[PDB]
Amino acid sequence: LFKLGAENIFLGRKAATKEEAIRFAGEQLVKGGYVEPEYVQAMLDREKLTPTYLGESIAVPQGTVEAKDRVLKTGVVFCQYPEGVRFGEEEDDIARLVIGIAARNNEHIQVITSLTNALDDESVIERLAHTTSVDEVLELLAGR
């Protein structure tokens, strides 16, 4: 359902807040023609309703159901934050993997399900969180 290559993998980023990380992911979704500009704020709007942190150092920010027509094509932006970005409810809920998603027809859970299926093992997340290799990222998510 989604293409993954060097153009949508971003390693070794840093962000003081989840809002900055979400804005970067949103900017990259706009940059790759996945979404129109209005989708960036829609991702921030969705984050306010309830965090997109999914546990296990992963966050998957996406837009609201209201922004479905601002999505041009299903896409993901894989963003690595080795130092972590607080994303969940608690201060302990830190994400090192921030995966920005844009899904046609508000199908975000299908994209999330595909990603989390490939992230079912703790060793895979740890490796993805600190790797400096784009190729390794592609390998670990290629069976998705």
């Binding site: 969705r46 965090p51 546990g55 159901v65 608690e90 975000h108 859970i109 999330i112 299926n117």
Partner: protein, 97 residues
Amino acid sequence: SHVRKIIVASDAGMGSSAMGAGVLRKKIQDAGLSQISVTNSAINNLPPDVDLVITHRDLTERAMRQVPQAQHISLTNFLDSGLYTSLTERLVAAQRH
């Protein structure tokens, strides 16, 4: 009238709902309960025929309201493995029984 439907709901039904659904789904499939179906959707969207509804305590009131006749299970944390494990064991017990 057999309990076989489990659905997870949330504010947008595009975040926490995705993870909750996946984990529960996996456990159910592992238990050999192919008869039980698992899906996720926004709170605003919950079919009246649903037997089990799983949401975050902060929104369980809402789901109860849409269907207070349905069975609702409240969570506390997104990765609360302890709660998830307990709930699963329970459903299995209720399946046989």
